[PDB]
Each structure stands twice: as C-alpha cells, then as structure tokens.
C-alpha cells in the first residue's frame, strides 16, 4: 500500500 495515498 502507498503511504502517501489518501489517508482520509
């Protein structure tokens, strides 16, 4: 999974 992807 991408850490910089949408976390909201």
């Amino acid at each position: 999974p991408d850490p910089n992807a949408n976390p909201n």
Partner: antibody
Amino acid sequence: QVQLVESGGNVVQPGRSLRLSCTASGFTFSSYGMHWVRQAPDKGLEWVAIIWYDGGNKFYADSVKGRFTISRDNSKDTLYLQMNSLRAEDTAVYYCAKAWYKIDDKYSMDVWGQGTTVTVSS
Amino acid sequence: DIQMTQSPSTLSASVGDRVTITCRASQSISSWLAWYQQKPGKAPKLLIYKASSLESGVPSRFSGSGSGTEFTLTISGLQPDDFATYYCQQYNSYWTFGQGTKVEIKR
C-alpha cells in the same frame, strides 16, 4: 479553527516508555489521517509515523520501527504515540500534524500542533 | 530515502528585497514538494504545495517554481514578518525535510 494540543512530554530514563497525546478540536477528527513529526538540532525535521483516518493503516520511520506505536481514539478525538525502549537520540520536540484536505495523487500535512518536549537521559 | 538539501543555509536580506531559496532532491519527486515556515519556539506553517500552489491565506509575495530534482522558493518584497527559517519537504515517498534555510536581517 483547527487546533492540535500535544501533551505527555517528560524526562524519561533510557529503556523506559512514554505515551504522548494529541487532542484535536475544530475539525472532524475521524475523517483525517494524522502524523507525528519530531524536531531536534541533531535530527532537523524528522517524520515519525502516520495513521489512517480509521486507525488501520500505519507506517513508521525506520528510526522508530519496532519501538514506537501510533494509535488513535476517534470517540475522544485524540491521537496517541506510545514510545517504548526510548533512546537518548529520541530526545526531541514531538509535533502532531493533520493530513491535508488537498485531493491529488500524493498527500502531506497542513496544520501542526505546538509540540511537547521529550528528554531521554540517565 | 530521498534526501532534501537546501541552499543557502543562512540568507541575509533587507526589507523590500527579492530573495530566493533553493531546494534539491536526491532523486526525482516530480512536483510533490511543499514549503513550510517556522519561527523560533513555534510550529511550522504550510506555505506552498505542489511546488507552485499557494496555500490559502498566504500572501502572494511567496511564489514557487521547479520540478523533478530542483525547486525554488522566492519571496518578492521581504516584510518583517518574513524573517524566519524555511523548510522544503518532499511527499513523493514517505516524508523527508530539508535542513532548513534561516532568513536573517542584514546589517
């Protein structure tokens, strides 16, 4: 507006544990990911950890992986950082930051708290 | 890890001057670069995102340019409130910061 208040910073002996809190107000805390960032002269600005809005996806920096645990309680609008096996190099000012509401392929943080100070020494 | 380095470390300037801070990345981060401003004893504050996009509430004297590995922050007409330390940050792969650039009063 958006307000982040850190607490829990204290003087701790090496190898012990400390728990930091970030109490949020002014925004819907349950909808945003949150970051922990630390600052010290030997470290500059150093990202520590991020947690997704629901508390599932968590990523850590190598410098703290295996020792620090990030968690949150959305019913209290409070973010936590559990620090275990603390080292002298962990001494820094610890900030909590909100992930921004800018829609794009990559995301970062916008609003920071005032910070709480952690000093690790014997 | 993508390394961020800023130039210069200390910039000496006067009110009204047009000054430029440079940020460089160890590898390409596309345009995923943010600039923050921090005053002593205070928290960082977001100024520019996506290299060139001004944050709402930030005066228009702050402008940004750059892509890939080289980026710049330019303050046109320095004001007394602008004397502080400015950090760049890449958010392409995790989050790493520059060492910081302190803008001081020239005398």
